[PDB]
Design a protein around this ligand. Sequence first.
Ligand SMILES: CCCC(=O)SCCNC(=O)CCNC(=O)[C@@H](O)C(C)(C)COP(=O)(O)OP(=O)(O)OC[C@H]1O[C@@H](n2cnc3c(N)ncnc32)[C@H](O)[C@@H]1OP(=O)(O)O
Ligand SMILES: CCCC(=O)SCCNC(=O)CCNC(=O)[C@@H](O)C(C)(C)COP(=O)(O)OP(=O)(O)OC[C@H]1O[C@@H](n2cnc3c(N)ncnc32)[C@H](O)[C@@H]1OP(=O)(O)O
Ligand SMILES: CC(C)(COP(=O)(O)OP(=O)(O)OC[C@H]1O[C@@H](n2cnc3c(N)ncnc32)[C@H](O)[C@@H]1OP(=O)(O)O)[C@@H](O)C(=O)NCCC(=O)NCCS
Ligand SMILES: CC(C)(COP(=O)(O)OP(=O)(O)OC[C@H]1O[C@@H](n2cnc3c(N)ncnc32)[C@H](O)[C@@H]1OP(=O)(O)O)[C@@H](O)C(=O)NCCC(=O)NCCS
Lengths: 164, 164, 164, 164, 164, 164
Amino acid sequence: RPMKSMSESKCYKNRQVFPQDTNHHHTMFGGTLMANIDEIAAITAMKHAGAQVVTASTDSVDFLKPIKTGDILQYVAMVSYAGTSSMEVVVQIRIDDKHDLAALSYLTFVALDDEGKPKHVPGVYPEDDVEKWFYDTAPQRVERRKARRIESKQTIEYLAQAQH
Amino acid sequence: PMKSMSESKCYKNRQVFPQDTNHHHTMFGGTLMANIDEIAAITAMKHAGAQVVTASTDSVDFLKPIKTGDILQYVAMVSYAGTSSMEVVVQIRIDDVFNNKHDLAALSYLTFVALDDEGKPKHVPGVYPEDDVEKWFYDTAPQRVERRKARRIESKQTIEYLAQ
Amino acid sequence: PMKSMSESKCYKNRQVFPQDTNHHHTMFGGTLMANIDEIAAITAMKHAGAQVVTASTDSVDFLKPIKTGDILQYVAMVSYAGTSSMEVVVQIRIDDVFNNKHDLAALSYLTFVALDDEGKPKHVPGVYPEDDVEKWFYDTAPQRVERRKARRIESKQTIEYLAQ
Amino acid sequence: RPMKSMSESKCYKNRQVFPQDTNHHHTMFGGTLMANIDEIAAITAMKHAGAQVVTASTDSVDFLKPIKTGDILQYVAMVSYAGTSSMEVVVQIRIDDKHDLAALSYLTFVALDDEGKPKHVPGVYPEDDVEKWFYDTAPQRVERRKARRIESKQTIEYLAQAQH
Amino acid sequence: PMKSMSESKCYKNRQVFPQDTNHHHTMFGGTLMANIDEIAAITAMKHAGAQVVTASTDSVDFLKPIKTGDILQYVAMVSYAGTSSMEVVVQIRIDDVFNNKHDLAALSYLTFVALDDEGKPKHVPGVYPEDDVEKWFYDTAPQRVERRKARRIESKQTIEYLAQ
Amino acid sequence: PMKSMSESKCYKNRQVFPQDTNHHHTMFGGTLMANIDEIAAITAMKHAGAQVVTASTDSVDFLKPIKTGDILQYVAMVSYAGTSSMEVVVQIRIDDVFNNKHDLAALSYLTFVALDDEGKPKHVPGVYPEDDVEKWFYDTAPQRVERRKARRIESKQTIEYLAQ
Ligand SMILES: CCCC(=O)SCCNC(=O)CCNC(=O)[C@@H](O)C(C)(C)COP(=O)(O)OP(=O)(O)OC[C@H]1O[C@@H](n2cnc3c(N)ncnc32)[C@H](O)[C@@H]1OP(=O)(O)O
Ligand SMILES: CCCC(=O)SCCNC(=O)CCNC(=O)[C@@H](O)C(C)(C)COP(=O)(O)OP(=O)(O)OC[C@H]1O[C@@H](n2cnc3c(N)ncnc32)[C@H](O)[C@@H]1OP(=O)(O)O
Ligand SMILES: CC(C)(COP(=O)(O)OP(=O)(O)OC[C@H]1O[C@@H](n2cnc3c(N)ncnc32)[C@H](O)[C@@H]1OP(=O)(O)O)[C@@H](O)C(=O)NCCC(=O)NCCS
Ligand SMILES: CC(C)(COP(=O)(O)OP(=O)(O)OC[C@H]1O[C@@H](n2cnc3c(N)ncnc32)[C@H](O)[C@@H]1OP(=O)(O)O)[C@@H](O)C(=O)NCCC(=O)NCCS
């Protein structure tokens, strides 16, 4: 199948952190971060897929270090895994000084056709070491995400029964 | 000291406005995550009786598309209490006001950490369920928690690698 | 056909963000009114089992200042059911998560009208209280309703005069 | 006491109604209207008072005619009554063609000093007929607002008892 | 066919809040520009008697910092009428309610084009001044118009050239 | 002291949604301008190594309508370095993910000034280009700078004159 580099659809974001972006302890609101993460990931996935996409799941968001008033942020997003119709997008959130990693997130997107049906996406390959790390560690993440979906179906059925 | 899941359980009924949705009239994943985080944090704060921070979004499963004009019900509760951490589960339902029936649109799990005035992790009360759904989430929590703990290991591996 | 006040009762737990407050860190009256209207409409829709429109905001009493960082609980319910109209009462409380205690920050009464698919006023179910607070608002509704009806007269006088 | 004309602090607003401002039946959201109303009223009150102000209450908002996608709106706000430290602001919302009155609102504001204590405001006088209508009909509205406050205190006490 | 400059004059009043400012309490240029575009568009729309689009924004100089708590009045009117295009002049004033002071902080010029339902440029009424200030803007418009028209060519050229 | 133009280059990616457009699916100029100002400021801040303020925005020509669903890439870099001031050039491109097409829709120039903690203008590093496109902007900057500097005088004059 047609292949793309991870760099090819890679997206960047630069953002300032203002007092209105943080709580009274000067820590940036998680919701704002989450909104930015999803936004940049969706564009990256659309670029890789060459089609419209939908967020299937947020696999994880880890908040490693507090982001503070006055900090400058750089977001880096890229496709780290390509299934048949699905993509894993990895998003790094760094505090710009040289850069410190403030947060790490993985999301899964599904490409859709004009009919709204899942559509095939190109494969992806890394070119430099970091890209290779994310590419190499993805299959394990994917398998875990799949196991979690399996368990989730049990909960959904229980919750559907709870309503009747 | 222990609290019931009901003591800190939180609800939110919300309309989905155009500012919340994309060009396909589907609610932003980022916005949903921000709303989820917002209500979950309040639940965690109520349970801990102290300030909290979002440690992670463990997962968000986007089950059914949420559309402009939909009515949503968010339900959040503490399903697990560690030493300093809490798992909050958030159910996001699409309310059918005409038929008094609701569809589960999304399911999310998050981890919060309670802090003292000095800003260091602080002990939280234990938690216990009382009704069936509470018991379902409470009973299935240990397996999720083990996964979260497993993820932390990998995040640390990636951080360690990225420091290059 | 009659419904209990509990059947359509709605809740909202919300954090107050900087985007919601002025330079004195006080929440906008307009924003509070928008949130009030939003939750009240959902309650009215649930009760009517049909689409609704806001006929009027009968009053909003701003009792205690709401500040950036506050946690709010909104509670909305139908306190009166006319032929096509409903009175919805909304309580806005400031939650003290530390002490599990809340202060009443604002009180509001609104009138909604149910509509059919053709867009004309439509009959709504009757309403009855079950617990003490519900009974309080239900019992005091007739006096408020007479005031609202009295106001309509004056609004019509003013409209009639303004047509000049 | 020092006196100001109603025209002296009068404020205007012109706004377009876009599809994103209206629901699926092309009717403008009440919350947006309410937000604009409070915003313009607060500025009018500040201008009249020559000081910071707070919204004491929203005395009423009547939605007389549906506002639709593509409509052009004009807001007119002015002080129609001046107590000792308080002001009534009347806000007219018109659909611009010659103009049709879509909504009518009355709010009460309280002027505060730098210490945050209620402060005396100038008196107000009308100059043209419409201003005179609003000025002339105010005392009755004020008295009704006062009677309503009296009743509200009973509810607040009941709700405060309900919590213990 | 001719209209006065005052006939289509539009207003917007808004105060500057902390969420609108940087770390030192200075208003964002983008917020100001968004507001300018909004009010100018309404004026142009009213004068044209049809939908409009922004063809261009002339430069804007920020001479003095606009600060948290400042109250701004935006005033817009048509200063020139071409065939299908209009120059809109927007005055941005700081209202100092405390001292009854009204200072002009910034001046902005924009060009709007009237369009028909087919989306094609449409003839507009002409415009005429009535007082000295209106006449000043009216008199100085032609030079600005000829310069921006030349500038459009320069812009097209630069874009075409860079696409290489 | 010198920095490359690429060294402080900043990015922002955002798609155009219905809430961002007028009745005919065309993007608001104000939204574009807000985005431009945001990304330019971050670039200037990074290059300066200090806080910055927008001194001015050169004119912007809207040559082609930006439409609902378009994906925009904002790219900002410093094209000129004065003593305390910088010219920031912002390219706005429409990414067409479907066809792997990247077209330059608009170009914008802004002037930023670096300030010290006292709020006084501060010396900035110089800037140098490395590739042809950077060099083009670098080469054409002085003319733009001298013209805007003259224009500031004109702006001050006009404001001083109108205050009469
Ligand atoms: C309400 C206002 C909005 C906000 O402030 S929240 C927006 C999120 N923004 C942030 O900046 C959060 C930054 N993250 C941090 O500060 C973290 O390091 C945090 C949560 C304080 C933990 O600090 P540490 O020094 O690592 O403490 P610790 O290692 O002993 O762990 C304490 C408990 O927290 C858990 N934890 C830490 N990191 C986690 C993670 N990524 N995901 C899930 N769980 C995590 C950890 O398992 C531990 O649990 P327990 O105490 O054994 O029950
Ligand atoms: C959820 C999406 C957001 C929205 O659409 S709501 C934002 C508000 N925007 C609007 O455009 C509402 C416009 N207002 C209207 O359309 C009204 O005329 C309305 C409510 C439909 C009533 O239409 P009418 O032709 O006058 O019908 P009607 O005179 O027979 O009265 C029907 C019931 O409604 C009541 N009512 C009408 N106007 C009212 C008012 N200002 N304040 C309080 N109550 C009012 C009226 O008392 C009557 O009650 P009942 O049926 O006897 O129980
Ligand atoms: C995913 C969705 C589009 C349809 O689900 P579906 O019918 O089960 O799709 P399919 O069964 O045909 O599976 C096809 C792909 O979807 C992936 N997928 C489906 N659900 C997933 C989930 N919870 N998590 C991760 N991947 C998922 C599958 O892995 C598969 O990818 P692959 O074949 O490349 O391996 C829908 O459930 C959904 O996501 N609604 C939410 C709307 C939304 O996301 N709004 C906010 C962001 S736009
Ligand atoms: C009103 C408030 C400032 C303090 O109330 P208070 O202590 O009772 O004030 P006072 O008893 O000293 O009364 C002084 C004035 O307030 C007026 N007032 C007080 N409560 C009022 C109410 N519910 N409705 C109308 N007027 C009221 C009184 O009429 C009086 O005016 P007057 O002397 O000119 O006739 C406070 O309760 C409040 O409004 N908090 C809400 C914050 C807010 O409004 N946020 C959104 C908008 S900024």
